[PDB]
């Protein structure tokens, strides 16, 4: 003997006794029966579609998730506390859609594409479905184009290519958001449109991020989707998908895009809350059965499509090019526990990860990139020729320094060979430190790595390496500007460019000093 159904109500039963005609009142009208914790149960709505967009009397909007035998569960996109049982609900015969196009650049929008920055309406000429399917395996193409972040460690040792999905993972307050924002800022001249999706954060921090983006001119090609911590769980659950559609708009038309999901853990939490309030059976850590299918079907849309796909999608308008979309999700772990449920699921889906260590962050090493365990499966094919050539010295120096770091404390009976390795390793480690909002173009990284590889830093004291590097880069920017322009435009690495770089480095040391 089971409990009462939502359809078992004295008034409804009286109506049913009355007559059974009209086919449950025209099959497209409902009646609220229950209201609790942002969930509304409706009676009727025969023609409800799983995922349909339901509109209530007040002017709100819902979304039917549970289509049960006699009732229809539905989350509320706005705020409840205005919905009372007895009101009427209607179905729009439509799935959730957001506006897309090159009019959302510079704007801040909801999870539904509604402006919240107070600059007026958004004149968008197109709409697109929130839930889509990733392109088929036959339409893809290999990743061979580079995405610069501006970090000397990342661009040399964990490269990121157009179409890759690189994870940023670490504990709290380790610099994940700053790395993502620096990656967004460094796209001034790449000509790729960025999308920053914020989930479950203080609106104070979101406003600070927006202000800092507008200060550096990075808002001319960026769209921010903000589902704050006080917003309903449905909006935080739908924010990544609405951001991903906005990003995909550019991929399907031959251009390149980059999207950053902030705190995918909070989307998982919001979806767990939504599922639990709808009485679905939980698994480990009270997560529903399909958390993996919640994340993977989102991250698999970040891809690179072949020229045939874009030529077919646009009916022959953009024939020449090939599009892409790069994702940079962010996961936070408790006390560096990467064996939990959600981080394990997210690690298995992506093509790499960038670990940030709390211990390295406290010791002053910033960024705290853990080079030992960080990996990028795309590998060499996601780097320009010059950096691809020069990264080997950095990689082997970090390896050798990390192998015998224990000797750094004794420093007394170190033989000649290992002392040289320690001296080089500490200097390279000091080299990788960097400030915020100051990205390095590929030319700066090339100059720094070449100077470090060929022993031109072997005679400068460890404590002053940062000043040496900054002064060298400034000197090259001042004198040899044509060479810098050449390197930035092309990325070629010849004997001519190498000789010019060596001549510049030798001239710097002879002339004025750091």
């Amino acid at each position: 003997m089971q409990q009462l159904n939502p359809s078992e109500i004295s008034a409804l039963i009286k109506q049913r006794i009355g007559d059974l005609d009209t086919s449950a009142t025209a099959k497209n009208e409902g009646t609220i029966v229950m209201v609790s914790d942002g969930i509304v149960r409706i009676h009727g709505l025969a023609d409800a579609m799983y995922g349909e967009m339901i509109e209530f009397d007040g002017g709100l909007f819902g979304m039917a998730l549970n289509l049960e035998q006699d009732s229809v569960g539905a989350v509320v996109l706005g705020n409840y506390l205005s919905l009372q049982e007895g009101q009427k609900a209607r179905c729009t015969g439509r799935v959730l859609e957001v506006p897309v196009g090159p009019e959302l650049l510079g704007r801040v929008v909801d999870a539904l594409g509604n402006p919240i920055d107070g600059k007026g309406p958004i004149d968008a000429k197109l709409t697109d479905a929130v839930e889509k399917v990733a392109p088929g395996v036959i339409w893809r193409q290999s990743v061979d184009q580079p995405v610069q972040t501006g970090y000397k460690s990342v661009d040399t040792m964990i490269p990121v290519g157009r179409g890759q999905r690189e994870l940023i993972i670490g504990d709290r307050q380790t610099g994940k958001t700053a790395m993502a924002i620096d990656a967004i800022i460094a796209q001034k001249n790449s000509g790729i449109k960025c999308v920053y999706v914020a989930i479950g954060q203080k609106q104070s921090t979101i406003a600070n991020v927006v202000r800092k983006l507008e200060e550096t001119g990075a808002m001319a090609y960026t769209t921010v989707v903000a589902a704050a911590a006080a917003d309903p769980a449905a909006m935080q659950y739908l924010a990544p998908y609405s951001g991903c559609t906005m990003g995909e708009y550019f991929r399907d038309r031959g251009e390149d895009a980059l999207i950053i999901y902030d705190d995918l853990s909070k989307q998982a939490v919001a979806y767990r809350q939504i599922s639990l309030l709808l009485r679905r059976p939980p698994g480990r850590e009270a997560y529903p059965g399909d958390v993996f299918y919640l994340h993977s079907r989102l991250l698999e849309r970040a891809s690179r499509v072949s020229a045939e796909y874009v030529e077919k999608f646009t009916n022959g308008a953009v024939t020449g090019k090939t599009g892409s979309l790069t994702a940079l999700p962010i996961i936070e772990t408790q006390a560096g526990d990467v064996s939990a449920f959600v981080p394990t699921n997210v690690i298995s889906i992506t093509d790499g990860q960038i670990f940030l260590e709390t211990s390295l962050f406290n010791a002053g090493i910033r960024p705290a990139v853990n080079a030992g365990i960080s990996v990028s499966r795309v590998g060499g094919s996601a780097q320009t020729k010059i950096i691809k050539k020069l990264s080997g010295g950095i990689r082997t120096a970090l390896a050798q320094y990390r192998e015998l770091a224990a000797f750094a404390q004794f420093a007394s009976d170190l033989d000649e060979a290992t002392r040289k390795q320690l001296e080089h390793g500490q200097r390279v480690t000091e080299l990788m430190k960097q400030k915020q909002y100051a990205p390095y173009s590929i030319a700066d990284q090339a100059v720094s790595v070449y100077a470090s590889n060929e022993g031109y830093m072997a005679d400068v004291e460890v404590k002053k390496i940062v000043d040496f590097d900054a002064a060298l880069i400034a000197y090259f920017r001042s004198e040899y500007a044509p060479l810098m322009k050449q390197i930035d435009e092309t990325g070629d690495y010849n004997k001519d460019i190498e000789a010019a770089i060596k001549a510049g480095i030798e001239s710097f040391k002879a002339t004025q000093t750091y």
Partner: protein
């Protein structure tokens, strides 16, 4: 137009109304016979609403008539609530008489929108040497006071209130969410002694009341602080309010206790599904807006000294600074007892505090965390066999640890009523000199229990 109680289980009451007249969510119901007050949580159909009780659930029958108010719980606000003690519903409990005001606001409100966020991030300075240097606060931020055994954390709170008041005429609000009655009474008497009670409003859920109280005292205090902020006086500019929540950990467990009975499945460690939702709803109203600001100081309890469970983990996303008290630092004779190496802040950034401040803080942290590492070597070998370097580090670290000591004005006993409230510039100058070495010849006992460098110089010269 009125309903009957049909089910009582623990603290979860049910009321059945006529289907035409059913109260909205968060409405306030008043049982006719008694002084108990209910608030609606859900709607279950057939005109049945499920509520929780703000007070004694003992002595309640079934079929007991209940009338509605058609509005959320409204509490008194204004200037007439300064110096009083009030429960959740706004009834005075200090037996000083009825509260003489008519302005009331609902305790449930929407968070401020994105548009009206503060255009900048001002810096708030107190005068405590440790906090203003290593863990700077933010105007309208959020500060947690983690850890700490039985120590003067309450002493720290009243020092903070005295400092904010005597420096700025801004008001204050204290909302003890599940606080021990002994500590609350001690705090009230201390405020009464120092003549600061004219500028504080209090709300108390006293840890032995039904979870509705311990759940909504914080919202009542926050509503009072919001009204204080939003009042624009004589220019068109709001005030700057300070809000205390003496234990934010009790707020989560207060909803955890009622979560299961309300008909919700559990979560990771048994918490409610809406833990993050409740914390966000509470914590998103404490922000600096275009007109006025609310800054807050919230003591946080870490269960079993394990801060990876959801209860403090979900709080960490909102804090702008974490001041960590310690047992040992207080034992060694350092009264404020803030941990220098562990206590951190999001506000320590060269863009917001300038470059010299940040560099001085970094140098002090490096010196302290190298001296902490030299401990085992010093204990085993002694001070003689260390290098010539790392002896200066030991001496300067000991001097720095001593110089964080501070005399508390409100004490007035065993100290001498020594209100110091040193300007930040004085501390910056002093620590720059100490790190550089201009004061390396002074005995370490001089740096103990004084304010600026003028006082330590005078004390050293006197001896």
């Amino acid at each position: 137009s009125s309903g009957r109680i049909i089910q009582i289980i623990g603290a979860v009451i049910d009321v059945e109304f006529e289907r035409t007249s059913v109260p909205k969510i968060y409405d306030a119901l008043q049982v006719d016979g008694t002084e108990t007050t209910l608030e609606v949580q859900q709607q279950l159909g057939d005109g049945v609403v499920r509520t929780i009780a703000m007070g004694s659930t003992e002595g309640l029958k079934r079929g007991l008539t209940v009338t509605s108010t058609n509005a959320p719980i409204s509490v008194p606000v204004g200037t007439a609530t300064l110096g009083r003690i009030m429960d959740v519903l706004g009834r005075p409990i200090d037996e000083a008489g009825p509260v003489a005001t008519e302005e009331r606001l609902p305790i449930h409100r929407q968070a401020p929108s994105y548009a009206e966020q503060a255009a900048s991030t001002d810096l708030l300075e107190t005068g405590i040497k440790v906090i203003d240097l290593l863990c700077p606060f933010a105007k309208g931020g959020k500060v947690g006071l983690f850890g700490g055994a039985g120590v003067g954390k309450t002493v720290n709170m009243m020092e903070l209130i005295n400092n904010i008041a005597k420096a700025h005429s801004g008001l204050s609000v204290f909302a003890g969410v599940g606080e021990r009655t002994r500590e609350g009474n001690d705090f009230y008497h201390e405020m009464k002694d120092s003549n600061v009670l004219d500028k504080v409003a209090m709300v108390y859920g006293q840890m032995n009341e039904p979870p509705g109280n311990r759940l909504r005292v914080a919202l009542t205090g926050l509503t009072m602080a919001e009204y204080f902020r939003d009042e624009k006086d004589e220019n068109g500019k709001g005030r700057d309010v300070l809000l205390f929540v003496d234990n934010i950990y009790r707020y989560t467990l207060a909803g955890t206790e009622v979560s299961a009975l309300l008909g919700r499945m559990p979560s990771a460690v048994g918490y409610q599904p809406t833990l993050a939702e409740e914390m966000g709803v509470l914590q998103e109203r404490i922000t600096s807006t275009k007109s006025g600001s609310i800054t807050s100081i919230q003591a946080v309890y870490v269960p079993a000294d394990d801060l990876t469970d959801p209860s403090p983990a979900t709080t960490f996303a909102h804090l702008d600074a974490t001041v960590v008290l310690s047992r040992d630092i207080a034992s060694s004779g350092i009264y404020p007892a803030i941990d220098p190496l562990d206590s951190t802040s999001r506000q320590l950034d060269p863009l917001v505090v300038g470059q010299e401040h940040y560099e001085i803080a970094r140098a002090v942290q490096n010196v302290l965390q190298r001296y902490k590492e030299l401990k085992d070597i010093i204990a085993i070998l002694g001070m003689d066999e260390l290098a010539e370097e790392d002896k200066l580090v030991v001496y300067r670290a000991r001097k720095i640890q001593r110089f964080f000591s501070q005399p508390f004005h409100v004490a007035e006993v065993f100290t001498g009523a020594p209100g110091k409230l040193v300007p930040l510039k004085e501390t910056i100058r002093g620590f720059k000199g100490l790190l550089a070495g201009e004061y390396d010849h002074i005995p370490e006992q001089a740096f103990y229990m004084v304010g600026g460098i003028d006082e330590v110089i005078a004390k050293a010269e006197k001896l």
